Symmetry: D2
Subunit: 263 residues, 4 copies
Amino acid sequence: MDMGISGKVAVITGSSSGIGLAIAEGFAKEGAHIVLVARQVDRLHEAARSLKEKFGVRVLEVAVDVATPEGVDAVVESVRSSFGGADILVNNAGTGSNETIMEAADEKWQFYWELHVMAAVRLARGLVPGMRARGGGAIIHNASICAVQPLWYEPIYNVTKAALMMFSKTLATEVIKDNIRVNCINPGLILTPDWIKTAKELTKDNGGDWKGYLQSVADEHAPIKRFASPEELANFFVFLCSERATYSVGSAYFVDGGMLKTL
Amino acid sequence: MDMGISGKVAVITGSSSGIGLAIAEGFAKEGAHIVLVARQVDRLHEAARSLKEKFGVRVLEVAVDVATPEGVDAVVESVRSSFGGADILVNNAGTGSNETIMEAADEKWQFYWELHVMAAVRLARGLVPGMRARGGGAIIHNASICAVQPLWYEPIYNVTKAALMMFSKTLATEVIKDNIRVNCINPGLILTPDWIKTAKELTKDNGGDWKGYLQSVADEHAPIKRFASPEELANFFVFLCSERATYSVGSAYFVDGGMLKTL
Amino acid sequence: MDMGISGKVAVITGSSSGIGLAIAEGFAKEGAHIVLVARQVDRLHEAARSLKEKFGVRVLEVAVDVATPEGVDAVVESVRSSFGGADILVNNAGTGSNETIMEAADEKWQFYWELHVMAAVRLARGLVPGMRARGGGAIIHNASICAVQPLWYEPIYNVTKAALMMFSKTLATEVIKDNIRVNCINPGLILTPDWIKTAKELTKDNGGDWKGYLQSVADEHAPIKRFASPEELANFFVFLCSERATYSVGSAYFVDGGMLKTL
Amino acid sequence: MDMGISGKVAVITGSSSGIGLAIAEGFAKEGAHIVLVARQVDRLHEAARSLKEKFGVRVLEVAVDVATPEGVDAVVESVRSSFGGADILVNNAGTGSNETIMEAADEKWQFYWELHVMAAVRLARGLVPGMRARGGGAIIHNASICAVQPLWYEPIYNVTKAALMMFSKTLATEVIKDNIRVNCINPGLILTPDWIKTAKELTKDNGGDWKGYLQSVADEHAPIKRFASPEELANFFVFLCSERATYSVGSAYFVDGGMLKTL
C-alpha cells in the first residue's frame, strides 16, 4: 500500500530514542523528511545520523524542551526556515509518573500539564498556520491506554493524558476545515528503554530476572501476553498520517493487544 | 427514603448562587451542616442567611478563591476549627469558556486548569485527612457533559473538564480504603443565571425573546426538549453523598435529559 | 428525600428472589404497589405475603416466563385487568452465562437474546401505551457491568447485556415524548444466591470455604474489596424511578464499587 | 508500506457491491486471494471477473444467505474445499433499518440479530479452526458508528450493531491464544448505493436533488462535511488485517470523519 508520504515533512517530539525514534524511522522508510525534537542533544545527533545513513531522508535536529513556550517557538522557526512548514505533527513527548494524590507536589501536576497538554496546545498554535498554507496535513497525539483506563500508581499521568486525549478531539473539529486531520493513538505496553530500565531496578535485589518481570506484567495486563515492539506501534502512526487514512478525524485509536478491558 | 445525612458536614464550592446554591439547599433539607465556599462575599451572605432561615442548619461562610493554594488552605482551616472536618465535599466551582485553540492565551488554559482540576486536587489533599479521621465520607466532582462530549466553542472547558473527570476516577481508587466514596456528576443543560444572562445578551439586538432562544438550544441538544432546574440536579448530588449510595465508587453519573448521544 | 411514588404501580421481573425481590421491597417501602413477575409460583406467593404484611401495599403475582412472547402477554393482560397500567417497569429478569464462543450452541445464543433483549422489547411495547395514558412513568433496564466490561467466561451474557444497554438508550430517545424516562443500571459484584451457590460449587474439593472465595473475587475485581448487598443496589433503582430523578433520560448508571476500570 | 498479505486468503461477506466489494478490491490489490460471499449470483460472477482480470488473484464465489445457518455452512465447506482455510475474515454483511420500537415486529428483531450478530458468531466458530491450523489470522467486524452513537430512526440496527461490537471484543479475548487478531471497524457516513437510493426516494417530491440531500446529511452530522468513498474505508480494513497491525486486538476503530460526538 502506497502511503503517499514521500517528500512530506514530519515533526516528531520525544524522538531521540524509544517510541519517538521508531515513529520517525517509520516515516523515514516512507520517504518523509523528518524534524526530530528532543531534550537530549547527543542522542538527537545519534538518531539523526542513523536516519540519514539507513534511509537517506533529510533530517533537521531541534534540541529544545517542548514543555516551555520558548522551546516550542524554536521548533516552529526551525521548521519554517528549513522546510516552510510541516505536513505531519506527532506529539510523542512525555513520561510516566509515580505518586499518590495525597503526597504529590503542585509543581509536579503543573509539570505534566505543561509537558502532555500545553506542548500539544502550543505546537498546534505554532505549526497549524504553516500546515494550513501547505494544503493540509495530519496531527497525532500519543496519549496512552491510561487516558481512558487509569493505572493506580500514576494519577497525574492519567489525568494529563485524559486532558490530552480530549484536546486532540477538540483540535480535530477546529482544524478539519483546513484539511488537517487530528487523531489520537493510545498505546498499551510498548517495550521501551524506560520499561527495561525499571525492570532492571526492580529485580536487582531478587536475582535480576528482568525478562521474567516484564513477562509477568504482560501476563497480568495484556491478553496477547507480550509487550509490543516500538516498530509495531510506529506502523499505526505512519498509516494514520498517510493519504490512505483521509477519513480519520477526531478519533482515538487503541494499540494495546487487548489490554483495554472496556468497549 | 432516609438519606442518613442529618448532622453531616457538607462543603460545597461555587455555592453563592445557581447550581452550587441549589446543591447546598438540597443538603440543608436533609439536615446537613453546610460550608459555603465562593468568591462573592455579599452573595455568600445572602445564601447563608437564606439557608439558615428556610432550613435551620448551621452554615459557615468561606469567601475565598479555590483556584489558588491560599484559598483552599483557608477552606480547610475554617472547616477544621468549626466542625473538626468534613463528611461531604462537592466540587462545583467553575465556569464555561469561549475561544478557539488558535487564538486563546496560555494564561487562560492555565486559569481553567487551576479552577477545574487543581482546586479539586488541593481540596482533596486538604480535606481527605479530616474526612478519613471522621470515619469516611463522600466526594463529588461536578464535571459536565462536555467532559465526554465536547462543545465546539469551549475547547479549554472541554479539556479541563475531561481532566477533572479522570481525576475523580483516580482519587476514587486512592481513598476508598478510607471509606471515602469519590464520584462524578455530568450535568447537561441546567437553567442557571449564566444561561439566562447569555440569553439576554444574544437576543438584545433581535427582539429580546430570551425564552425563545433557550427553548431552541434545548430543542437542538436535549431529547427531553427542556433545561433542568438546578433543584433537579441537586437531588442527584444529595443521593450520591447519602448512606443510600454506599456502592457508588469511581463512577460518572450523567444528568443530561438525553443530551449524551453515545452509550 | 420524598421519592414521590406512593400509590404508583411498579412492575418488576425476576422478583421472586435476590436482586428483583430486594428492588421490589425498595419500591414497597416507598408506598408503591407491586406486580411481581417470576417463573416460580410458590416462591411468588410467599414474596407477595411478605410485601403485603411488611409494607401494606397491593401485590399482584404473575407466574410466567418473560423469555417467551406468551409470558409477556400475560404480564400485560394481568396489569391491565388489575391496575389498568404501570407507572414503573424494572426489567431485571436474567442470568449469567458460561461458555466459549467456539463451543456454544445457537440455541444458547437465542435463549439469552430472548431473555435479556426481547423480554424488555416486548414489555416496552406492551406496557408503554398504558404508561403514557397514566401521564407517563419510568423504565429501568438492569444490564450489567459486563455490558461494557466483558468477563472472559461468559461471552453470551456480555453480548446480550450490551444489546440491552443500547436498547435502553434507543427506547429512551423514542418514549421521552410520552413523558417516560428510560434509564439503565449496570451493577458490579452483587451478593446473590447464584454467587453463593457458585462459590460453594467451586470450593467443594478444596476446603468448602465459599466466603473466602467470594472475598478473593472482590479483592481482585473491586477496589471497595466487597460484594454489594442487593439492598444497596435497590436504592438506586428506586431513586431513578422516582420524582427526584426527572432529568435522567437514556443514561447508564454504574453501581460497581469501583469495578469499572475505565472512566 | 508492505502489508504482508500476498497469498493470504480473504473471506469477505456482503461483497457483491458497495463497501464489501471495495474492501475485497483492497485485499486483491495487496495480492490476497478472495472468497466473495453474497446473495446475488450474477452480481458475484461479475465482481469475480473484475478481480481476476484487474489484480490477477484467485476468486471463489459463494452464493448464499449468511443470515441462515445453512448459508454459513456452505461458506465454510467451500473455503475448505478450495483453499483449506482462511487467513482473513471480514464480516461486512448487513443493512440499515427503519422503524419505531413500538411498531416493529419480533420477526424484524430476529432477522437483524441473525444477520448482524449470529452470522459473525457462526462464521467465527466455522472458520477459526481452519485459521488456527494455518498459523493464525485476522478477523474484522464491520459494525457501525451506530453501535455507540444510535440514530433515532433505526433502533434495531443500533441494538444489533452494538451486540456485534461487543461480540467482536469477546471473540478477540478468546481467540488471540490461537494467534488470531479480532478487531472492529465503525464506519460513519459512507457513500453507498443505499444512501444514493435513499436520497433519491426522499427527494422525489421536492426537486429530485439527491446530491444536495446527501451534502446536508454530511453538513449536519460530520465535521469533514462529506461522505467517505468506500475506497477510503477499505484501506482501514486492509491495514488492520495486515502484518503491520499485529498489536491490534479487541479494539474498535472509528472511520467517521469526525461524526462521533464523544471521545
